[PDB]
Paper text:
We have determined the structure of ALSV at 2.87-Å resolution by single-particle cryo-EM with a cold-field emission beam, which allowed de novo modeling of atomic coordinates on the cryo-EM map from a relatively smaller number of particle images with an improved B factor for map sharpening. The cryo-EM map revealed side-chain densities, and allowed de novo modeling for the whole virus capsid, except for three short segments (41–55, 100–116, and 146–151) in Vp24 and several residues in the N- and C-termini. The Vp24 subunits form a pentameric protrusion around a fivefold axis, and the protrusion sits on a base of Vp25 and Vp20. One of the striking features is an ~120-Å-long N-terminal extension of Vp25. The long extension has intimate hydrogen bonds with Vp20 (0Vp20) and the main body of Vp25 (2Vp25), and forms β-sheets with them (between β1 of 0Vp25 and β9 of 2Vp25, and between β2 of 0Vp25 and β8 of 0Vp20). In contrast, a smaller number of hydrogen bonds are found with Vp24. Thus, Vp25 and Vp20 have rather extensive interactions with their neighbors, and Vp24, which forms the pentameric protrusion, is more loosely held. Also, there is a hump or protuberance of genome density beneath each pentameric protrusion of the capsid and a pore with a diameter of ~4 Å there. The structure of ALSV and observations reported here suggest how the virion is stabilized and points to a possible mechanism for genome release through opening of weakly interacting Vp24 subunits.
Residue numbers in the entry:
A (entry chain A), E (entry chain A), I (entry chain A): 3 to 168
B (entry chain C): 2 to 216
C (entry chain B), G (entry chain B), H (entry chain B): 6 to 40, 56 to 99, 117 to 145, 152 to 190
D (entry chain C): 2 to 55
F (entry chain C): 56 to 216
């Protein structure tokens, strides 16, 4: 298997809107570089022939709101490709998750350690990062906050396999 | 001495040994041999090595509200123009004909405390995105970073790549293309300004001159 | 240099096959014959701007019968020198013999040219396979459509 | 410097160096960057690690 | 690549005339051993199959004039195959070029370090040595001075490639 | 150095008093070179300027030249007076074995010297004092080099776009 | 000794090909058959006055069909000893076996002679390729026209 | 042991060639078949009285066409054991297996005998080449006519 | 090349007559073991396939005369296959050659160091030993002296080449 200590990919995900309101909101960002779009990203140009890879992800996350907008933010990893519609805040506080007020901390970097039951990420196995606003978002009269993430790099990269070039 | 003399294959043949040369008909002070080494020296009072660490270019373009869709290119900068402009920083740079240059670029948008949107600052190195591009497939993958335009001022460095060992600057319209791309609609859209102003400051992180222009 | 084995570069069209013989191929990771991305080497070359490294080419020939393999195949290279194989294949390793650092892949030139002496009669197919060597390098990024 | 420059094949290209980011229009205490590591923590008052041995 | 520490070639360039006058004069000497003439020089006999080479050049230069002839001489390298019709003496004095009076120093040896953007010299990439007389040449009533150079040797030679023998 | 020219003058212009080469200081300080463009950015301040002259001659001909600094620009280039040449500030020098230079300070009525749009900074001239040494079978034109340098500069105001 | 691979020394004329067989070749970097410079080895030999070193010859044969390769080729050398190849080629390395220091190239003699036993029937072509070895040397200069 | 390569020992006469097959050859540096000096090994054996050492034999066969090479050749040795070659040649190294010190060359016996299984049909020639090994020795002098 | 420290050959040359008389006499002995006769000598039996050899020769020389016979003998090497009809005794005494009176010293051993311009001896390149009697031979009324040499051995032997067995 090829090993890459640092592998920059600079892939930015789609920016996701959130209208202001009291309803609990979730923004899901899957981190699947094997996912193809209009252009092939730096990951696919060099390691798309692989069947699966392994390594820690670094993600730059950003929440753009007004200066008079309040919200609590829970950044939650989701491994092994599970689907969560609702979160139990009791469970999050029991796991010592700390929420951040987007009126004070609305920029950050998330290190995602490698966690997969199968042993590697793939086209079908990838981590998810869920931005969970439990109280919704309280903003000025029709605001939409935007949550945008960028997969910055992959640390301690390892990859195996050899797919067919379709 | 016989045929078992070992032969060392050298390219220096002894058909021309030490070429002595002696002055005959005049005085030495009237006939001198100079031994020099023609190396490249950057000038003393100017030359890109003074811009090392300092700004050399600055623009302030604008973009409208309606151009803030996902993917749209807001501002563009050809590096072959930024390095050949009319300012004093550029004219000191067009004198370098070939060499190396690592360039810092910084972006800064002036906003209220109401609106806030995210922007990507990309370095399209092969100039594959004209300014009339709303793709976002190309934007999402180009080397660069995202930043919030209300509380922040984002900068990064990039090295100009040459296929050879140095980079010919003279008549080189393939030095790269920096873009500012919009990722999302603004925060609030009602009763807001219809245009914005972004400042771009190109600096020199490092410059080496392997050949200098002389008239 | 993580591709498993020889990947398919190019099949000779079944019209110029038995007609005499000479087969010019540029030493490049790009499918320069098309002036479309075919395999993983072409894909990596199209998503990068520059390249350097050694390329291991191998020509495989198929005849009508074993009797038609009247000689062993040869392969010439230039930037005339040749290498001689066996009657059914010929390998040729081409190191980076351009005195530059990198060569451009596509819109942002060849490391030379191979000339394969084609068979002259009763041949069935002539294919060319390429291996990206070990000291290979693609030192840039470049946007490529996914359509 | 000539063509005999040895080339070390790295995957890190210098087309994007150190991305500096500086606060301009407000105070830092109003705009903070957090660096976290999203690891899995079993809960405090329950979780199978209490049944270990039982 | 083959490496040669010292490689003597003893190639002499064409001797170039200069009529006396006040007009600024330039004598260009390209140093392209791949250039062929009537006879193959020592460079081509051993390293003409190469695509390109690298190494420092040593050039013996000579200015033959009268004893009552005055001129200032600027020996200027030109790399990367640029064409200069006129020189800015301000630029030359800013780069600390020193001129020599041919009535006092009219013989010399010029070391040309390897400078090429591409990484090597070739049939199309070669250094040039320009003998620039800014004030012309002041001689006795119809004199012509002659400038003659000889490529003596190549130090720290290195060469690559394999061309086709045409 | 910040400026350098190489003008020419003919044999027939080597009468006593004739102006051979001229240089307006407002042009030498606003030229197209890199030395000048760094100087046109200074809008006001002080500048003491060195000027050097150098003529290329055979060992046969040798004539004397005066290098004058006409500070109020009272001598157009078509002047063969020598009454004005003999009294202007400057020095004589032989053009065959020598290369003559001198310094001069730009004078301002005020405390500093406004450079912007100032067409009254002076006028340097090279004047011929005598006919050449030998006149038969000689070159019909000469070449003189002028090198203007900065001895001292102070900037009391700098141009900003 | 910087030439890449086997360079082409000589093709046997297509009249003396099937007629019996014997093929005398002098061991020399010069195209002594012409008593014109053909490739890089001939060029280096013509622009020098003296030479010594090992030469690696290789004869490549092409038959009408594979059945005509009725034996494996042999190559004799003298200054009779032989070496045996395969049915489609034969290599022979000839070291410097003259007890002198150098041999003259052209107008200022051979290191021996190879004798190639030619095929006797249904052969198509017989070519000879030469490699300048590794301990080679051309120790002089000599003027050669560039016309 | 300074002879360059395989020297020619003996050609099988073109009458006993296709007739069945068996070919007895004595392991000796002498041309014992003639009970005349042929090559350098025979010359050294005739100008000496005694000999010991290893001999490397090699049988080369030539067929009418490639189809006639219906099997790979074998070679037997005795003082029955055999060695198997390929379809066009067979090598056999014979060490000194006599428990004496030297064997007489001529008038002052064999180190054994090789038995070559000849082809049975559509063969063209059968030649035998010999190499004097490396631990060889001719320990005497003997007068030989120069006529 | 094969190397033999000591190589005995015991080849005797033809014995050469000299009649008594006052005329200056020369007996030439070429030492060419490649030269064939009726029988092959020890040199040819082992090293006749060679193209050329190298090594110092040892020669036993012998002059058989009466007890009342006087002569001066100059033993002179001749390398590079030159032909001398007459010798200049001035030149021999200038080169410090010492003559021997055959009435006192008429037996000896001559060491011939390897001297050849080409680099080796061969069928055509061989040393010669000339027995030069400047005053002739003074003997008793019809005597013939006989000069006989034997090539004893070859020291520091070295040989190359591989000829065709004709």
């Amino acid at each position: 298997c090829l090993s890459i200590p640092n592998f920059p990919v600079h892939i930015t995900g789609k920016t996701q809107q959130l209208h202001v309101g009291p309803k609990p909101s979730i923004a899901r960002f899957s981190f699947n570089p094997f996912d193809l779009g209009t252009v092939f990203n730096r990951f696919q140009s060099l390691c798309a022939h692989l069947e699966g890879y392994s390594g820690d992800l670094i993600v730059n996350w950003l929440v753009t709101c007004s200066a008079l907008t309040n919200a609590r933010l829970y950044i939650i990893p989701v491994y092994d490709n599970y689907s969560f519609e609702k979160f139990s805040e009791e469970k999050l506080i029991q796991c010592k998750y700390e929420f951040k007020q987007i009126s004070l901390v609305r920029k950050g970097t998330v290190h995602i350690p490698f966690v997969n039951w199968f042993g590697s990420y793939s086209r079908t196995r990838f981590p998810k990062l869920l931005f969970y606003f439990p109280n919704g978002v309280s903003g000025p009269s029709g605001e939409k906050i935007h949550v945008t993430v960028q997969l910055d790099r992959i640390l301690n990269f390892s990859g195996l396999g050899h797919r067919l070039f379709k | 001495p016989d045929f078992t003399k070992i032969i060392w294959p050298t390219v220096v043949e002894r058909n021309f040994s030490n070429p002595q040369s002696e002055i005959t008909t005049t005085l030495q002070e009237l006939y001198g041999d100079t031994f020099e080494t023609v190396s490249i020296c950057p000038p003393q009072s100017y030359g890109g090595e003074l811009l090392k660490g300092k700004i050399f270019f600055s623009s302030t373009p604008e973009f409208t509200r309606e151009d803030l869709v996902e993917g749209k290119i807001l501002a563009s900068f050809k590096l072959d123009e930024v390095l050949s402009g009319l300012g004093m920083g550029a004219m000191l740079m067009t004198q370098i004909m070939s060499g190396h240059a690592t360039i810092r670029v910084s972006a800064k948008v002036m906003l209220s405390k109401f609106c806030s949107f995210a922007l990507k600052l990309v370095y399209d190195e092969l100039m594959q995105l004209n300014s009339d591009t709303t793709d976002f497939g190309k934007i999402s993958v180009l080397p660069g970073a995202i930043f919030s335009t209300q509380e922040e001022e984002f900068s990064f460095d990039f090295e100009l790549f040459s296929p050879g060992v140095h980079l010919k600057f003279d008549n080189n319209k393939l030095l790269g293309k920096v873009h500012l791309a919009a990722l999302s609609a603004p925060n609030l859209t009602e009763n807001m300004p219809e245009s914005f102003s972004c400042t771009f400051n190109f600096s020199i992180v490092d410059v080496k001159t392997t050949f200098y222009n002389i008239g | 240099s993580f591709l498993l084995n020889y990947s398919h570069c190019g099949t000779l069209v079944e019209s110029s096959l038995n007609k005499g013989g000479m087969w010019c191929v540029p030493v490049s990771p790009v499918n320069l014959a098309a002036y479309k991305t075919h395999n993983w080497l072409h894909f990596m070359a199209s998503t990068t701007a520059y390249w350097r490294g050694t390329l291991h080419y191998q020509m495989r020939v198929t005849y009508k019968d074993r009797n038609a393999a009247c000689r062993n195949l040869v392969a010439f290279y230039t930037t005339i020198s040749s290498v001689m194989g066996d009657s059914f294949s010929v390998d040729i390793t081409v190191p980076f013999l351009i005195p530059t650092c990198y060569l451009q892949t596509i819109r942002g030139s060849c490391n030379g040219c191979i000339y394969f002496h084609l068979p002259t009669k009763s041949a069935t197919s002539v294919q060319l396979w390429v291996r990206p060597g070990q000291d290979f390098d693609f030192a840039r990024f470049r946007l490529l459509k996914a359509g």
